[PDB]
RNA sequence: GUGGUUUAAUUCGAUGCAACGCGAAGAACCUUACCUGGUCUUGACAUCCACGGAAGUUUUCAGAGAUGAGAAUGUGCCUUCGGGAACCGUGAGACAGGUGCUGCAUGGCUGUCGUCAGCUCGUGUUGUGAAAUGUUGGGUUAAGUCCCGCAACGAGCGCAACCCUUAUCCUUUGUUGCCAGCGGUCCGGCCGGGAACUCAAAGGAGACUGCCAGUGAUAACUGGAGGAAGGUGGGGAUGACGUCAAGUCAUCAUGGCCCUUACGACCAGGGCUACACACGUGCUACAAUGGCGACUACAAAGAGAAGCGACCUCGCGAGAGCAAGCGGACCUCAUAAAGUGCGUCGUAGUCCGGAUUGGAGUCUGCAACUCGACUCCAUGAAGUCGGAAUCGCUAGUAAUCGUGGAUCAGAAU
């Protein structure tokens, strides 16, 4: 068995890799069940595709907080870092994609004097 | 009333000396007073702003 | 157009505060008001002495008050007489038993707060400023330092129209939040009008 | 150009008793001389009698009456209204 | 086995007193589990620097309350005698 | 908010953009500066002198208040040889004050083109000179970006970088976290226990166009690999030589000018919330990712003494009546909203949408008719994406929903 945390926005999804069929359990619920009807649910199992696992590995995820998206990206990183423990050599390839990495873009209150707390109020052509 | 302000009467009625309450000195409000100054909550403020109360100062932040 | 106060922008770095004391929500006011009230007299009664600063520290119910003067001789008075007068008269302001120190300042030329007074003083009288500044800037540069700049707006030379003299030497990076540049500001009363004096003293990078 | 800010004038006498009857509800009609006082909540439901200069008239205080002076509900003069005085 | 938590506002006056309590106990008593920093609860206030205009100012202030552990085990008669007597720190609140 | 109109008068300033919840970051006597009426004084505030009783406290009469009148408890302290410091009151003398005008007299601070961006200097050369050249010409580039030729050669601010928040990782620490791992478990980390993980804090590591292909004199541009992110990865604070003689002398400071029984002071009462019309700026107006009904799972930063207010009871209620606890990283404000699971609906004015209105009623507040919040009870429209026009936005962003805080006794769309 191997463990993989996984961070993103404000969600934490622990990943427990266990050699088996290929089914995963998201909060005592199947993958399709939890992430029911969501084109993004696929990106969650992307890291398992590169190194080609899934059909060889069974996972047990435990996420909490944030939204499905943040969870999807959370489980991802968790699975990626979890694959590292199984075989460090996987890093050389898995890393290439960019799964062994979280992400900022953490929502921030729209700063005043601006609009997106990021974009400043442009000026009408000089 | 000038009658209600019977507190001024040193000698209380049938009740023991404990009958004597307080009564404000400026307005005469028995509701909320301040023993130290003997003035009501509405007088201690008006007297504070005027500065007539020595040593007293408005707390800031 | 202006530039953020140097002393106030580098407070987080190399530039201590004028008063350092623990927190106190309900007493934060009284103390400050007291710290500002004590400066009032320390800014006048201690004029002729080149008052650079007036650090302040407040324990439980006391205060040190360390006034840094160029010539403590006048601050101390004859065989220590003025200091006794101050500590007493100041006590009237706040019943709280206050202390008093007179740490001198080695060569005022390095202290901006003093370089400003030297300029205004000459201006208050009647003398070519370009000379005063050219000299002051030279003094602070002579004694050492790495940079120095002086400025004076108002009606220079009693001219009808207001002007702003410049001149400077060395390096005076105001943008470099680290330079640790000692700033100053000395007013100046005159028959033709008021005039402010600004001098910058850059000493060391760190 | 009315004005009261935060300093309403309520004769300290007609204000202390009106509060005394608050111990347990209200008290029967009372009588006051100084009409300069202003009507307020505590005097709701009670029946204060203002002095018109000759006698005391019962003025049933109401929430809608709050704010106005007792003297406003106590007519000084007396106009018979020489007529069928209807409505 | 006596735990001594030292809390205060000033960071320096703590290191002075804390180190003292240790050194003095390093002789008579054990070597102590060593004085650690521990988490410090902080309170910050964001108020505008300038009084007029400049809403984007608001400098940052903070009143920290540092803590310590020390913890002196295997206490001896003299181990305490070197504590009850010497006590300099004034802004430090001891808790034995 | 303003013009107009009106009124005895409902203060003043601001006014195309750089006026109009703008200064009042909070006007029901105070603040106000307005008005009628009554009334005082060295007096609301500063310094000082002489003087009999003099510090101080508590009451009475009259009154709208103010004010006036009047009555009664009584000194330590610096020294006795004589006195004498202090505060205070009266009489008397010398004197105070002003947001009252002018920021085209000004300092300071700030806004604006601008955070846009270049702006300048030394020397040589050209002109009698004010100045010009230097930054012209050819090819090129996002750019004076860089060469070739070249009266020009170099240099200092601006940009950029330096700081901080949000990510990659690492080191230090952990009563935040978690059977990740084991044990107990009222199975609530709760506990034992341990620091991996999350998180908290500090420091440090990382892109520099270095590598590959194309173009080019070069810079650099374009494509590509590697890479967590790249050509200032995403953002704050910050706004130059100088402009408009920009805003403010009611934040403050300041030159000049202008008032001292009054354009000073106290107090009661009457408002700032007048119209036949005209205008500017805004809010309410009309579902079905939007929302609604139920259920359920996560955050951070702050606040609380008469105040935050658990819980109970009345109300499809606000909030009451009652009332525990904390004084607060141990009680409360709190429910985080959304999400997650389920259901309703698909354009029919149909419990969809909730305006408007009637009745009842609690409360904050000395008051809430004009100015309230909320909601019990009933009514329940405009709509099925709405005339001429017009505004914000590009990835977790738009639109949309809810919460906290600064100002603050208290009305914060």
UniProtKB/Swiss-Prot annotation, chain A:
SUPFAM superfamilies, A to Z: Ribosomal protein S5 domain 2-like
Keywords for the protein's UniProt record, in alphabetical order: Ribonucleoprotein, Ribosomal protein, RNA-binding, tRNA-binding
Pfam families given in the database record: Ribosomal_S9
Record GO terms (molecular function): RNA binding; structural constituent of ribosome; tRNA binding
Record-linked InterPro entries: Ribosomal_Su5_D2-typ_SF, Ribosomal_uS9, Ribosomal_uS9_bac/plastid, Ribosomal_uS9_CS, Ribsml_uS5_D2-typ_fold_subgr
Gene Ontology BP, a term: cytoplasmic translation
Highest taxon, organism lineage: Bacteria
Record bears the keyword RNA-binding: yes
HAMAP family found in the cross-reference section: Ribosomal_uS9_B (MF_00532_B)
Complexes and interactors: Part of the 30S ribosomal subunit. Contacts 16S rRNA. Cross-links to the P site tRNA and weakly to the A site tRNA.
PANTHER family per the UniProt record, alphabetical: RIBOSOMAL PROTEIN S9 (PTHR21569), SMALL RIBOSOMAL SUBUNIT PROTEIN US9M (PTHR21569:SF1)
Family: Belongs to the universal ribosomal protein uS9 family.
Record-given protein name: Small ribosomal subunit protein uS9
Taxonomic classification: Bacteria, Pseudomonadati, Pseudomonadota, Gammaproteobacteria, Enterobacterales
Swiss-Prot record, chain B:
A cellular-component GO term for this protein: cytosolic small ribosomal subunit
Family, similarity comment: Belongs to the universal ribosomal protein uS14 family.
Subunit record text: Part of the 30S ribosomal subunit. Contacts proteins S3 and S10.
First-to-last residue of the parent protein present: 41 to 101 of 101
Protein name as annotated: Small ribosomal subunit protein uS14
The entry's keywords: Ribonucleoprotein, Ribosomal protein
Lineage: superkingdom: Bacteria
Keyword Cell inner membrane: no
Annotated organism of origin: Escherichia coli (strain K12)
Keyword Ribonucleoprotein applies: yes
Gene Ontology molecular function terms on file: rRNA binding; structural constituent of ribosome; tRNA binding
Function: Binds 16S rRNA, required for the assembly of 30S particles and may also be responsible for determining the conformation of the 16S rRNA at the A site.
From Swiss-Prot, chain D:
GO biological process: cytoplasmic translation; ribosomal small subunit assembly
Record-level GO cellular component terms: cytoplasm; cytosol; cytosolic small ribosomal subunit
GO molecular function, one term: tRNA binding
Keyword terms, alphabetized: Ribonucleoprotein, Ribosomal protein, RNA-binding, rRNA-binding, tRNA-binding
Cross-referenced Pfam families: Ribosomal_S19
Function: In the E.coli 70S ribosome in the initiation state it has been modeled to contact the 23S rRNA of the 50S subunit forming part of bridge B1a; this bridge is broken in the model with bound EF-G. The 23S rRNA contact site in bridge B1a is modeled to differ in different ribosomal states, contacting alternately S13 or S19. In the 3.5 angstroms resolved ribosome structures the contacts between L5, S13 and S19 bridge B1b are different, confirming the dynamic nature of this interaction. Bridge B1a is not visible in the crystallized ribosomes due to 23S rRNA disorder. Protein S19 forms a complex with S13 that binds strongly to the 16S ribosomal RNA. Contacts the A site tRNA.
Protein family: Belongs to the universal ribosomal protein uS19 family.
Assembly, per entry: Part of the 30S ribosomal subunit. Binds S13 and L5 and cross-links to the A site tRNA.
PANTHER family on file: RIBOSOMAL PROTEIN S19P FAMILY MEMBER, SMALL RIBOSOMAL SUBUNIT PROTEIN US19M
Name under which the protein is recorded: Small ribosomal subunit protein uS19
Swiss-Prot record, chain E:
GO molecular function, one term: transcription antitermination factor activity, RNA binding
Domain of life, per lineage: Bacteria
Segments passing through the bilayer: none
Ribosomal protein is among the record's keywords: yes
GO annotations of cellular component type: cytoplasm; cytosol; cytosolic small ribosomal subunit; small ribosomal subunit; transcription elongation factor complex
Keyword Repeat (UniProt): no
Annotated keywords: Ribonucleoprotein, Ribosomal protein, Ribosome biogenesis, RNA-binding, Transcription, Transcription antitermination, Transcription regulation
Gene Ontology biological-process annotations: cytoplasmic translation; regulation of DNA-templated transcription elongation; ribosome biogenesis; transcription antitermination
PROSITE patterns named in the record: RIBOSOMAL_S10 (PS00361)
Family: Belongs to the universal ribosomal protein uS10 family.
Function: Involved in the binding of tRNA to the ribosomes. Part of the processive rRNA transcription and antitermination complex (rrnTAC). The complex forms an RNA-chaperone ring around the RNA exit tunnel of RNA polymerase (RNAP). It supports rapid transcription and antitermination of rRNA operons, cotranscriptional rRNA folding, and annealing of distal rRNA regions to allow correct ribosome biogenesis. In complex with NusB is involved in the regulation of ribosomal RNA (rRNA) biosynthesis by transcriptional antitermination.
PANTHER family to which the protein is assigned, alphabetical: 30S RIBOSOMAL PROTEIN S10 FAMILY MEMBER
Listed name of the protein: Small ribosomal subunit protein uS10
The species this protein was found in: Escherichia coli (strain K12)
Taxonomy of the source species: Bacteria, Pseudomonadati, Pseudomonadota, Gammaproteobacteria, Enterobacterales
């Amino acid at each position: 068995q191997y463990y993989g945390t996984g961070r993103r926005k404000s969600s934490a999804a622990r990943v427990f890799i266990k050699p088996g069929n290929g089914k995963i359990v998201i909060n005592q619920r199947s993958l399709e069940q939890y992430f029911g009807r969501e084109t993004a649910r696929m990106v969650v199992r992307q890291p398992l595709e590169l190194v080609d696992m899934v059909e060889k590995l069974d996972l047990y995820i435990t996420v909490k907080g944030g939204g499905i998206s943040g969870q999807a990206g959370a489980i991802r990183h968790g699975i990626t870092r979890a694959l590292m423990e199984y075989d460090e050599s996987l890093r050389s390839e898995l890393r290439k994609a960019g799964f062994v990495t979280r992400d900022a873009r953490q929502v921030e209150r729209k700063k005043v004097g601006l609009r997106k707390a990021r974009r400043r109020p442009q000026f009408s052509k000089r | 009333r000038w009658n209600a302000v019977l507190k001024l009467q040193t000698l209380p009625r049938d009740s023991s000396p404990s009958r004597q309450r307080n009564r404000c000195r400026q307005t005469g409000r028995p509701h909320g007073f301040l023993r130290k100054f003997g003035l009501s909550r509405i007088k201690v403020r008006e007297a504070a702003m005027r500065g007539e109360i020595p040593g007293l100062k408005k707390a800031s932040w | 157009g202006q530039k953020v106060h140097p002393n106030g922008i580098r407070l987080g770095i190399v530039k201590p505060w004028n008063s350092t004391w623990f927190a106190n929500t309900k007493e934060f006011a009284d103390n400050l008001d007291s710290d500002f009230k004590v400066r009032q007299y320390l800014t006048k009664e201690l004029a002729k002495a080149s008052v650079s600063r007036i650090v302040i520290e407040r324990p439980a119910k006391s205060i040190r008050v360390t006034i840094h003067t160029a010539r403590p001789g006048i601050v101390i008075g004859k065989k220590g007489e003025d200091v006794e007068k101050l500590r007493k008269v100041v006590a009237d302001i706040a019943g709280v038993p206050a202390q008093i120190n007179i740490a001198e300042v080695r060569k005022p030329e390095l202290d901006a707060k003093l370089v400003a007074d030297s300029i205004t003083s000459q201006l208050e009288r009647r003398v070519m400023f370009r000379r005063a500044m050219k000299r002051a800037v030279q003094n602070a540069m002579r004694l050492g330092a790495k940079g120095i700049k002086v400025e004076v707006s108002g009606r220079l030379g009693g001219a009808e129209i207001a002007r702003t003299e410049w001149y400077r030497e060395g390096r005076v990076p105001l943008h470099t939040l680290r330079a640790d540049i000692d700033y100053n500001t000395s007013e100046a009363h005159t028959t033709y009008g008021v005039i402010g004096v600004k001098v910058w003293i850059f000493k060391g990078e760190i | 150009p009315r004005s009261l800010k935060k300093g309403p004038f309520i004769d300290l006498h007609l204000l202390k008793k009106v509060e005394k009857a608050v111990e347990s509800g209200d008290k029967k009609p009372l009588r006051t001389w100084s009409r300069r006082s202003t009507i307020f909540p505590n005097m709701i439901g009670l029946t204060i009698a203002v002095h018109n200069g000759r006698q005391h008239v019962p003025v049933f205080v109401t929430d809608e009456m709050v704010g106005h002076k007792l003297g406003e509900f106590a007519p000084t003069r007396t106009y018979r209204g020489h007529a069928a005085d209807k409505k | 086995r006596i735990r001594i938590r030292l809390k205060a506002f000033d960071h320096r006056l703590i290191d002075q007193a804390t180190a003292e309590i240790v050194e003095t106990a390093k002789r008579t008593g054990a070597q102590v589990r060593g004085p650690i920093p521990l988490p410090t609860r902080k309170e910050r206030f964001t108020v505008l620097i300038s009084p007029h205009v400049n809403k984007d100012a608001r400098d940052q202030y903070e009143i920290r309350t540092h803590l310590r552990l020390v913890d002196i085990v295997e206490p001896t008669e003299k181990t305490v005698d070197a504590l009850m007597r010497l006590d300099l720190a004034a802004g430090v609140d001891v808790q034995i």
